[model samples]
Every structure is written in C-alpha cells, then in structure tokens.
Target: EMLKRMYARVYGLVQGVGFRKFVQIHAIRLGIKGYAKNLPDGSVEVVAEGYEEALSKLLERIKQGPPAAEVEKDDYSFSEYKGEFEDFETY
Candidate 1:
C-alpha cells in the first residue's frame, strides 16, 4: 500500500491568485484528499493524503501552480498515514 500524507506551506504570490481553486481542481482530479487555505502570513497551507504516486504528482503540480502564480517556496513533509480526509477542498 502506497499510503502517504504531506503538509505543505507554500510561499510567494499565492494568496490573491486562484491558487486555492487550482489546488482543488488538480487535487480532485488526482484523487487526493485534503484542504487548502490561505494563512494569515500570506502563505498557503495544504494537507493532503493519498497514494504516494498520486501525492507525488500533486506536489509536482503544486510546484508549477497556476499560470499567474509565482511559487517561491514549497516546504513539505511526510507523516504517518492517517487517512483523515474524504475529499479535496479549499478553505
């Protein structure tokens, strides 16, 4: 079983743009379960869980972000799989 979970804090021009929507769209398509939201520090935080392959793809896509986005930093870490989500959404 390729279970994996990741928490990412993305920095740069991620707030005003449609980054949340982009995450929601791609995550759902990739069959990832998580939520994305804007933090008070103008960063975007994401918690995702799924098969390792799918999660890897999610990270890759997030690195590119939307066309209008400029992703500066993406800090992520893997954790013990807990299967806490049922779907992807933007909060």
Candidate 2:
C-alpha cells in the first residue's frame, strides 16, 4: 500500500463542535496516525498519515463532520508520509 500524509484545513462550524474528536475517532478507526486540532482562525487542522485508501476514507468522513458541524470546505494537500505519530490525537 502506498503511504501518504494528508494535511487539511477544515473550514466552517468546526471549532467548539467536537469536530476534532470526530476526526480523531474516524482516523483511529481507519488506522490513520496524526492529530486534529483547532487553528487560531477558527478552522480545524487535520494532519493524517496512512495508506492512501484509508486517508481517502478519513477525508470523506471529515468533510461530513458531526451533526452539529457544518463543514464549509476542506482544503487539503498530500505529501510523502512520515511515520512520526503512533496514534491519532485531538486538541
């Protein structure tokens, strides 16, 4: 499997809506490793590394956040994978 890293900035109705936790759960379930945290600009920053397919699944789930979240946009990019994280995290 080809490993990759997905760096995403999820905009809109994300912060304070448990969006990071939502992302963390999905990432863990998909066997992804990284972190989801709030940016000062009110967007959620998600950095995940895993198999391409798993990352894809996680990204789709992130696009449709928790019920309280209204995901406006998920701007993302891919890069070479770095096996630095042991598990997914939320902050």
Q: What TM-score does model 1 achieve against the real structure?
A: 0.95
Worst 10 residues of 2 by lDDT: 82-91
lDDT of candidate 2?
Answer: 0.91
Q: Cα RMSD (Å) per model?
A: 0.9, 1.0
lDDT of 1: 0.89
- In model 2, which regions exceed 4 Å deviation? none
What tens digits encode model 1's per-residue C-alpha lDDT throughout 1-91?
Answer: 6898988888999988899999889899999999999999999998999988888888887887899889999899888789899989888
lDDT of each: 0.89, 0.91
Give per-residue CA lDDT, model 2, range 2-83, as digits (tens).
9999998889898888898899889988999999989899999999999999999999989999999999987999899988
Regions more than 4 Å wrong, model 1 = none
